[PDB]
Amino acid sequence: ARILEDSPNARINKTILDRYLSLPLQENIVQATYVWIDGTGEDLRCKDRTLDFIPQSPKELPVWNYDGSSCYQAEGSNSDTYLYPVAIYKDPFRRGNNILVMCDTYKFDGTPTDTNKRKTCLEVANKCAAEEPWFGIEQEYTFLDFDGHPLGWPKNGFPGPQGPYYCGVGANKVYARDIVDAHYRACLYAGIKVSGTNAEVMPAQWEFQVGPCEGISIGDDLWMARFLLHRISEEFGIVSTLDPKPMPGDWNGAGAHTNVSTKAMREDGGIRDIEKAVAKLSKCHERHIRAYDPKQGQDNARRLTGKHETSSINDFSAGVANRGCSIRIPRGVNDDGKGYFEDRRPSSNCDPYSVVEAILRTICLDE
Amino acid sequence: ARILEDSPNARINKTILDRYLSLPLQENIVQATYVWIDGTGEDLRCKDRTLDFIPQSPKELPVWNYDGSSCYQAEGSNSDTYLYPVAIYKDPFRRGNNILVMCDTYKFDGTPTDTNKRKTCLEVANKCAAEEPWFGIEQEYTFLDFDGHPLGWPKNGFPGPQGPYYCGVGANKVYARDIVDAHYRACLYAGIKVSGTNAEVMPAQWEFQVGPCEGISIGDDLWMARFLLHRISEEFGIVSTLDPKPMPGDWNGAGAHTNVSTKAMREDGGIRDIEKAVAKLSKCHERHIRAYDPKQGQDNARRLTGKHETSSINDFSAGVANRGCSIRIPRGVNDDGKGYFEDRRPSSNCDPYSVVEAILRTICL
Amino acid sequence: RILEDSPNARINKTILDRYLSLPLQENIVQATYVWIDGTGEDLRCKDRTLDFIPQSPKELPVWNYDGSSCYQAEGSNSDTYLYPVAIYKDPFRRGNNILVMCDTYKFDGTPTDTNKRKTCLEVANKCAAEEPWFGIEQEYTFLDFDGHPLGWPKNGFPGPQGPYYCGVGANKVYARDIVDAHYRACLYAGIKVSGTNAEVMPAQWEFQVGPCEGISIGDDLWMARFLLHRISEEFGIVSTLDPKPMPGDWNGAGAHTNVSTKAMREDGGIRDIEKAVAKLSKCHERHIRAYDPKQGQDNARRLTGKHETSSINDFSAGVANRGCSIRIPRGVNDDGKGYFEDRRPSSNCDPYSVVEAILRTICL
Amino acid sequence: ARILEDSPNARINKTILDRYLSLPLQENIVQATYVWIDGTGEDLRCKDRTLDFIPQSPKELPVWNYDGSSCYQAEGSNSDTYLYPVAIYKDPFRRGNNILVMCDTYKFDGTPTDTNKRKTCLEVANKCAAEEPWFGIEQEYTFLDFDGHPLGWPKNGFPGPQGPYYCGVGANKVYARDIVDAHYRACLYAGIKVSGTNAEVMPAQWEFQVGPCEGISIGDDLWMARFLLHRISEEFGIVSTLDPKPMPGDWNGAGAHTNVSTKAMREDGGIRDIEKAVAKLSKCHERHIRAYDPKQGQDNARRLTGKHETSSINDFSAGVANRGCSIRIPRGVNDDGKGYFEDRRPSSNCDPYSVVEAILRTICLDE
Amino acid sequence: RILEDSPNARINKTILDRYLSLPLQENIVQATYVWIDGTGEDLRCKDRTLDFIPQSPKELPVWNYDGSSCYQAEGSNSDTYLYPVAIYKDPFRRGNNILVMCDTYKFDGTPTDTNKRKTCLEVANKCAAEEPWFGIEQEYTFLDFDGHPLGWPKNGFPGPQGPYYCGVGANKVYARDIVDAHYRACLYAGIKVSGTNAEVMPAQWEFQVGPCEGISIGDDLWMARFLLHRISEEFGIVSTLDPKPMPGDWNGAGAHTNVSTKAMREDGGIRDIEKAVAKLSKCHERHIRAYDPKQGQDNARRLTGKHETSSINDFSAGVANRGCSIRIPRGVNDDGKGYFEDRRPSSNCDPYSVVEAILRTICLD
Ligand SMILES: Nc1ncnc2c1ncn2[C@@H]1O[C@H](COP(=O)(O)OP(=O)(O)O)[C@@H](O)[C@H]1O
Ligand SMILES: Nc1ncnc2c1ncn2[C@@H]1O[C@H](COP(=O)(O)OP(=O)(O)O)[C@@H](O)[C@H]1O
Ligand SMILES: Nc1ncnc2c1ncn2[C@@H]1O[C@H](COP(=O)(O)OP(=O)(O)O)[C@@H](O)[C@H]1O
Ligand SMILES: Nc1ncnc2c1ncn2[C@@H]1O[C@H](COP(=O)(O)OP(=O)(O)O)[C@@H](O)[C@H]1O
Ligand SMILES: Nc1ncnc2c1ncn2[C@@H]1O[C@H](COP(=O)(O)OP(=O)(O)O)[C@@H](O)[C@H]1O
């Protein structure tokens, strides 16, 4: 009755679309959905165009543009903002040779927009290329009803206390698995390396893991995966939020925990290299928590500095297999004496480009 | 409209998923769902990962972990808990080469968790192998709406008294058969030997039978089957509960009656062996009740009173084709001089590993 | 309001199809055993996984159920046995899956009170040389979960009879989808459903089975009944065989029974038809006793002589006449051969008892 | 929201009437409501007329008529049926000098209707005038919603089992006390001797007791109490039923237990006269059952099974302090050597005139 | 949704008034007899017409009821007797109409199992010399018809505790109308209600009765409970006295009892009190049995030692302290004299048993 009752998309018919989706087209014709990051640094925008050819590379896609003043990227008279494809994926909605196109964005003068964090991240990731840095990201998120309350939670109230929902199974334990399952498979079909999923501590809260991807491709892939989550959830009338505190107080906020390695760390006795990198990471702490947050640490501080599977934003701790510590070497990695380390500081709404750039600067470029 | 009105999963669209399900993936890509028992010893948990190969046995799969502090399996600062794969099944939700994996769980130091009953059962099952013991379990369960009241029952009250609902047919006799049929088929596809189903005495109450299964297999199989029931139910917005007394008073609680035979018992003249086994089980009643419910024989006490065709919690009686009993020999087993016997004591929420072990201890060791 | 409280109507209906397309290894066979309970009117069922494709009812195992849970308590040994009698293709699962009609037997091998097949079969076998054929017109009514006829205004009545019989239209007949699904399921299963029609009462319908030789009418009508209840379950709709599912001047329900022997079907058999009707005239009370499963109590509520119906007490029979106990149809009196129509059996009759009683009187 | 949703009277505004009730008229305008029993023998009918005078006794009221063919009292084309006042009460709905009139009925030729039982009862009661016989009746009844299900019961189902509802207090114990309380007060005001009320075993079930009344007046007063019950219930959209089994099974039926005493049973040593009457009623069980029911034993046969605190229809019994019997003599009476006896046979829908006559015929006219 | 299924909430409430206002001759008197049933928790009532105005209880007729219809079955001798023991003016009917508190007796003239008044009264008269005064703080909770606390989100919880205690506002306290109506109806009836407040738990409230001399605190509290249920009823809201109307870290329910003798109150002061207290430290186990009507089984649920309550095993005494079993209020300590607080009695206690036990231990040894 109440659940999704005001959500426009949940109330529109979902069956008719298949009639039109079945329509055969000249294989020549290609619909391309260009996706980009808006002025908030948090949200995605998209639009599409018809091509008459199958592109092999993002360089073969035309440069496009949008009204930056309609996306919180105003620039007086000169608000036309340009779209530079950087990465191509198969489209799981249209399936043909139809494609999704991640972009980065440039002002009219050829300079990056404020929210373009990929330009510099790429400079750096090229300059550490020889080190073959690999990143995994654990993206947490919460499903909301249209009124902003977490999906399925009683209106004007709370479901039972945490305990039964983590990795839960059952109608009273986890909600909207359908979307999670759809999204997992859509990401796979699109060529994004999602390595798994789980249900989180808060009911309506989930996680998917992406990686491991090399260098800057973790940013393109996570951004596209976010796009896909929002877009799939839209069809259901459900809002997916990346906000780190989608509900105040005792309930679990949201991280984007980031797993890192270089070729040396992955090699035999890389443990010493890891332990070195964590030391370096462990103290420049005030500098990273700024580029782990699209508003420079104001979002972080709603979730962080507590005792709910997180990290204190105040100070810094580096433990082994410690969910309480900002940066963490897993037990099996100590045991193996090689592998990777987990940075538990990035917030669910982090920009991955900023995260990897801060990381690489510190552990490869030697600041 | 009240039925399922507040169930989130029942209020979310169900046809969109099929679009995404039919997406074709490159081969190499396998989705594996790991499943384990949590610190309650009753409830299941699960999560997924992507593999780049097709495993051939459980041994080929990666050991994995979870946070036990989030599963009622806290161990201070060392809360990481380990998932060991013990059985693979085909995945009926995702099909193809996708798989479901039953696990057992270990603490950070390599010891079993309190609710891992399989390590100790596996040991005993292995000592008893040559007697080739076979187990079947009749798992009773009940469908609930989101508010915890049994599915389709009138809000704040009761349907008609017992009688019409057992093995029923008709819109006013039995509810949500679609889940039952979907589950029977899913299990069969998964490789679980579901041997039957029926609607039970209580409206919204049902049973599926698993077996016969070789030794430790009954435990892996029944756990995975329970998983499948919860997980299929979930899509409908419906809760499946294995609680033994999901409504109080004169409403049939729930059992997990266990059928047992050894090789001796299945060969001509087995009835002698069956007779002896029943004899031994009669001198250690209390120990079995304690292993026959995962809270030491306390959820056993809200059901096993000595009424509604059942055992008594304090009292051990056996008999030939007798349902007011603990241990029963079926008429057809007696008439054939060979076969299997029925242990009626275990409750719907028993851990099958514990039931098996207790039994094999008494009648093989 | 319509079906708002029917649990099965409120549960999602599209998810099942995802699990139904699940491919299983050839040779796994699901078998659903079906039986009549201690009311003598209602059906029960459950299912088992089999190893093999049975070639005939004898190849299937004997099973059991707890009689105490279906009004068949025999104190301390209530374990009741299920003997397969007929096998049908399963229209719900298809493949090699089957439904299995049974009859039922106590612990000591004697028949339960509601097993009327045993005794009917002895009689029908004795009459086999007369090749008796039976056709049955099974009437029924769809109900909402509250017991009120489906679609009828709550706490009230739709317009008077006239427009609904064999109707077409959203305001003339209800739930044809179940009717059409049943019709085809029955044909797929191997049941000889010869026709259907909408009846005089809105939400009321009829299916005809036959002609079937002997005992097989009984098996087949029972499985068709099971199929009706079972298909209508998935819609959340109750199908009742109650003979007077609403009181007043609203059409009750019959299971009119058409009957012929070898002699009656050959030219000049009309003589033998009249012989048979005459033997049935002389023992009216024993048939009305056989013609509902409480011995003449349920038919009384229908048989008022007013609504296309015969008298409770008084036996009558005439050509072309729907006010009579036993009617000889126009076409058959004209043709000099065919069958007679027995209009006495109520919609909740056991066809084994009906067959047996008619065979005893016209063949014995 | 279902309780009373389909009941027309519950869905009509209730405060508007007050506006019109407070309209003053001159004391000499009298509204008289004539009430009678219809051809079912169970239900009441009524209608109103304006008088210009205040009658002093039933003798002073006009004899009236109605169309019996609309009340199941057809008699072909001579269907005009006559209404003779026999009792007047003060009207608790209009107050002032307005009145309710209980009547009995008579066919066009002056002979009584089949459902007029008063006539032959009053013949009898007059011959027993000396014995000064008193009657109390314990009228059980059930409130139903408009769909025929008991008021407040879950639709298509049953509330919790019996036990908590008898003389209960609490929103989840008893329902519609306002009607019970209104009616009790309205009976008193109208001039009926209502001695008490209680909530009964079945939820939605209630009882009021009337008496002790002298002779024939028990009949007139109880029929008028009945009228008032339905007429008051009607306002709330609630149906009040006197059906003896308003729900089949292990749910308590409804009786009209009748307390009886003569001058002689009330004096010292009266108990001796009592045990003699019981014995006389014990010799003719089948006579009474037929007088105890608007048919002749048909509705009793659904209530009276032996269980649920009532006598068997088949055989008779006495005892003391026993609620399983037909005729109960209270303890407090045996102990005091005087009082009355309780006939527990009459069903809730009995016609009281029929109950009284049959009892008097037996215990006074020595039949 | 709130009160949507409560029959009394859905019945028109304005019509009754046009009937109550009807006038009747002055010595027509409606009397409502009130008694405790076989649970020893719940009340029952029924009513009769008198033709006179009673001056005291003894002028009312002894009456009876069917004990087998209220869990007071004694086979075929089930008629149970009502003895009037206290009269109150009737706030629902006004005029000379009355409410009658009774105690109950078997057919043989002996007290029913749930009459604690008879023995309580014996002891009270023996301690009359020492002029004992009692004050009781009765907590209770309002429930919707489904048993969920009134106004709480269906299938869930409101915000944590903090804002509700002594709260003001539509989102802080619920159903103040019932509380005000009860407060006043009690005062009019002759019951010495001395205050009320909204409790920690949302929908939870309290009223205080007393100080009352001796046995009358039991009569008066019982009749106040009656009034609460009966007023609640007209709104279609349930009032429960269950000590833990919701599980976990939501505030249970007490019936804290304040106590004094003449000594303790007249100047002599806290040395009489400190001795009285030390007499209670001796017998905790015995008092927990007197302090709910199943003898420790319901208390165990709110007496956790957590959420401002004492633990059910261990005894404790502190000044101005709220974690203790017995309490000396700072205010009484500061002064020569006063009363002491007993914080162990549970919301569903029988006050007659609370008084008796306190009096045996303290005025009698
Ligand atoms: N050597 C590595 N370097 C970087 N990332 C890795 C490496 N190995 C694994 N990862 C990635 O880290 C992520 C692990 O997330 P998850 O399984 O949720 O870990 P946990 O929940 O134990 O913290 C996965 O995407 C995985 O692919
Ligand atoms: N020899 C045997 N040993 C163990 N289990 C058996 C044996 N034979 C059959 N079983 C299993 O016993 C179970 C019987 O379940 P069910 O038909 O519900 O029995 P009932 O309802 O009569 O107790 C099924 O799992 C069946 O496969
Ligand atoms: N000669 C016959 N002998 C036995 N049964 C017959 C014969 N002819 C027809 N039937 C059966 O009787 C049924 C006739 O029912 P129906 O056509 O509904 O009759 P009506 O038109 O009078 O309702 C058919 O379903 C058919 O199987
Ligand atoms: N002497 C008497 N003769 C006839 N009826 C009496 C006499 N004394 C009292 N009564 C009536 O008996 C009835 C008592 O009924 P009730 O109080 O319900 O008792 P119980 O609890 O035994 O059913 C009242 O109608 C009362 O007026
Ligand atoms: N001397 C006394 N002896 C017994 N009871 C008393 C005495 N003085 C006050 N009381 C009663 O104790 C109750 C106090 O309850 P309350 O005001 O809620 O106290 P608190 O909430 O501070 O514990 C009141 O009914 C009060 O009348």
Residue numbers in the entry:
A (entry chain A), D (entry chain J): 3 to 369
B (entry chain E): 3 to 367
C (entry chain D): 4 to 367
E (entry chain I): 4 to 368
The authors write:
Glutamine synthetase (GS) plays a crucial role in nitrogen metabolism by catalyzing the ATP-dependent condensation of glutamate with ammonia to produce glutamine, ADP, and inorganic phosphate. Drosophila melanogaster GS (DmGS) has two forms, namely, isoform I (DmGS1) and isoform II (DmGS2). The cytoplasmic DmGS2 is the most abundant form in adult flies, comprising 90% of total GS activity. The three-dimensional structure of eukaryotic GS has revealed a decamer consisting of two stacked pentamers.
Herein, we report the X-ray crystallographic structure of DmGS2 in the ADP-bound state. Within the decameric structure of DmGS2, each monomer bound ADP with identical protein-ADP interactions. DmGS2 had six additional N-terminal residues (NSARIL) that formed a turn not being found in other GSs. The short helices, α-1 and α-2, the so-called meander region, located in the N-terminal region of DmGS2 was highly variable and also observed in other GSs, such as human and M. tuberculosis using ConSurf analysis. Moreover, the meander region of DmGS2 made contacts with neighboring subunits in the core of the pentamer. In addition, the pentameric structure of DmGS2 indicated that Asn11 and Arg13 from one subunit made H-bonds with nearest-neighbor subunits at Val176, Ala178, and Ile 5, respectively. Arg4 in each protomer of one pentamer forms H-bonds with Glu7 and Asp8 in each monomer of the other pentamer. Furthermore, Arg 13 from one subunit forms an H-bond with Ile 5 of the neighboring subunit in the other pentamer. Those interactions in the N-terminal meander region of DmGS2 may stabilize the five monomers and strengthen pentamer–pentamer interactions compared with other GSs. Thus, R4D was sedimented as a large, random oligomer. These data indicated that the N-terminal meander region that includes R4 is essential for pentamer formation and stability.
